Design a protein around this ligand. Structure first.
Ligand SMILES: Cc1ccc(/C=C/N)s1
Length: 330
């Protein structure tokens, strides 16, 4: 089997991407944030505290003839931005772009933090990291990809995120028309539960490539590119007036600037992020200070190849017995 679904930016900045997902019988379609940095499929639901729902579409398990309570199971998750959610668990039929999994754990939120309530466009998350990170207790649950894998034509999914435009998530096949050149594959460590890999270096604009190993994760659920402070300082030093602002929480730059590109290495190959992809717009409405798309990872504990980096590539998440990642230009 295969599946193919369009993913759409939630706003004009590409702050996140939503993909429609069918849950239950008859189908209830929710728009989920596909997140290769976590491993829980959770949704706003008829069980979510009413004051914490503001415009989201909810899953109502009592209206699904295939829903079954997973008795005794609870979940609770905290993310890198400080947001969180928790609740109980149903199994139900879940379909993505024509690919159907029966018995998928659907984690129904009883509580969500304010940042989720405030994002009316995101009805939940669909985790695509390794199932060892799934938070369901006392019986850990499998991700949608892990459940689908055996049925897929090939044990892979691909992320093709657009810049200010829709893109595609494919399951079970590699669309050879969706990228240019060849795909360069690179090793993955699953030890922390992430799609963790080592970039071979970077360049700023037209500058020379610096060969240096940068361990990080491929995370479709993180907006920005978070890299070591040395790398990030070298980038912003090429932008007149750019500075790190403790009050804003990162590097800002004059909105009048033209940003240089940023290149990252994948083995001997190179992915080029155009400068425009690094502009996240005014820090507050009407400001002439703009927020940068490349930020320091120093306070995180891990480097994160988020959407800023991934949207510049066609990315293969290869879930073979030994997982690997593939990157192609597009
Ligand atoms: C909207 C989102 C908040 C936290 C997420 C997890 C990123 N890996 S996605």
């Amino acid at each position: 089997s295969t599946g193919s679904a369009t993913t759409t930016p939630i706003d004009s900045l590409d702050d996140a991407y939503i993909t429609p997902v069918q849950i239950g019988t008859p189908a209830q379609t929710l728009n989920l944030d596909f997140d290769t940095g976590s491993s829980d499929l959770w949704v706003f639901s008829s069980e979510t505290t009413a004051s914490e729902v503001d415009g989201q579409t909810i899953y109502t398990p009592s209206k699904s003839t295939t829903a079954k309570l997973l008795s005794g199971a609870t979940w609770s998750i905290s993310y890198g931005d400080g947001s969180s959610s928790s609740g109980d668990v149903y199994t139900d039929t879940v379909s993505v772009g024509g690919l159907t999994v029966t018995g998928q754990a659907v984690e129904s939120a009883k509580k969500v933090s304010s940042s989720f309530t405030e994002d009316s466009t995101i009805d939940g998350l669909l985790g695509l990291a390794f199932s060892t990170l799934n938070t369901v207790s006392p019986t850990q649950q499998k991700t949608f990809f892990d459940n689908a894998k055996a049925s897929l034509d090939s044990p892979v999914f691909t992320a093709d995120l657009g810049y200010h435009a829709p893109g595609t998530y494919n399951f079970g096949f590699i669309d050879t028309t969706a990228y240019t050149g060849s795909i360069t594959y690179t090793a993955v460590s699953t030890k922390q539960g992430f799609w963790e890999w080592t970039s071979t270096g970077y360049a700023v604009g037209s500058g020379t490539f610096k060969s240096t190993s940068i361990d990080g994760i491929a995370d479709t659920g993180t907006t920005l590119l978070y890299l070591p402070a040395t790398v990030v300082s070298a980038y912003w030093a090429q932008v007149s007036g750019a500075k790190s602002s403790s009050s804003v929480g990162g590097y800002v730059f004059p909105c009048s600037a033209t940003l240089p590109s940023f290149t990252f290495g994948v083995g001997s190959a190179r992915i080029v992020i155009p400068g425009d992809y690094i502009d996240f717009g005014p820090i507050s409405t009407g400001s002439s200070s703009c927020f940068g798309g490349i930020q320091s990872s120093a306070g995180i504990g891990i480097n994160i190849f988020g959407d800023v980096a991934l949207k510049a590539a066609f990315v293969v998440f290869n879930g073979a017995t030994t997982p690997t990642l593939g990157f192609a230009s597009k």
